[PDB]
Symmetry: C2
Subunit: 226 residues, 2 copies
């Protein structure tokens, strides 16, 4: 199959946050069926960034989700054509981060192109003041909609002092493939845990890891529901 037990990925991210232009590139690898992946990222233009790199974290890889309980895999099924994802993240303090991402497969390497736009981040907020300390894990809720797959997520960002900064997002994943055999998943969840393993040069070099698993609620049901 096109998606092997071990896969490499390359990324280019370009955009702006509060009008500040920047560009990042990255390369990594992972085990798509295990739901694990690692990415080494460099800020190639605009570094050192005047905002917390944490806001870019979720924009740097859907092919690396372990699918349990027979939940159809929207992403792995999309190759060789690939897919796109579009998202809007709203922070509790006004900041909004919108992304349009394209995922392709070239010569056996996954290729990502993310176009990002961050707006209205408060000048004295943790993001613009670089007082963030990584994300907590989260649970995404998904279901078919708008000719694709819709996902909703709520996340908490650790901040200096021991508090948290909340944000939520809605995503629409769209397949570039037109296949009679394509199997669409139904309502389900994806547990995520994105952790920063390393960083250097005022966040101009960052190493991120993510573990993701598609699953159903583990609680028993009185009606025989998933």
């Amino acid at each position: 199959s096109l998606i092997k037990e071990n896969m490499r990925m390359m990324v280019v991210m370009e955009g702006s946050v509060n009008g500040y232009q920047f560009k990042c590139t990255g390369e990594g690898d992972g085990n798509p069926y295990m739901g694990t992946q690692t990415m080494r990222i460099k800020v190639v233009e605009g570094g050192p960034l005047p905002f917390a790199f944490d806001i870019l974290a979720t924009s740097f890889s859907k092919t690396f989700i372990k699918h349990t309980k027979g939940i159809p895999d929207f992403f792995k099924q999309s190759f060789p054509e690939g897919f796109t994802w579009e998202r809007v993240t709203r922070y509790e303090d006004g900041g909004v981060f919108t992304v349009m991402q394209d995922t392709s497969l070239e010569d056996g390497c996954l290729v990502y192109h993310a176009k990002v736009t961050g707006v209205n981040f408060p000048s004295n907020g943790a993001v613009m003041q670089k007082k963030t300390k990584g994300w907590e894990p989260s649970t995404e809720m998904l279901y078919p909609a708008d000719g694709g797959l819709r996902g909703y997520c709520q996340m908490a960002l650790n901040v200096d002092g021991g508090g948290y900064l909340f944000c939520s997002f809605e995503t629409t994943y769209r397949s570039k493939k037109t296949d009679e055999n394509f199997k669409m998943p139904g309502f389900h969840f994806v547990d995520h845990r994105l952790e920063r393993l390393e960083e250097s040069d005022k966040e101009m070099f960052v190493v991120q890891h993510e573990h993701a698993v598609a699953k159903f609620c583990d609680l028993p049901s009185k009606l025989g529901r998933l």
Copy 2:
């Protein structure tokens, strides 16, 4: 302890939806430590309601959450004083459901008083057209805030035709107890599965059941985090 292996509860809910006044009463039983509970509800004023009972479901019981390790029980620790919860649920189609709830313990029985207000529910929406078919399970994300415990949830309501209606809410849980020995939990999740077991008389009688468990993310961590 004040909260026993088996507990009963009594509830009174009064308020309005889109200007329509109603009142409900209920009594239930559960096992607080197992995280299970059942409530038998009757609409005593305004029935049959012109809106889907489903929108009231989450307003009818935090004492019934299973706890294993690492997460102190904000709710069970609050007795005998009890606690309150305040919440705002926003539906993707404009409807907003706001609640102020009081939880007390009288003569060994849990007593709930919920004051609710639903506004702007679209006339032709699933709620006002009574085309809803129960909630999917969900995962609530919690952390300390505003002198209490903050909770965020995202829920999907099944609707006639096989689709879903999305909503999300933010809650603030406040303990009525002042105790220097009170242990505040840190960041965690609560998995919920609320199901309707029975109903009759155009929803003038409803039996709901809920299973809830406080937990950390299931996924392993690369950094030894919880």
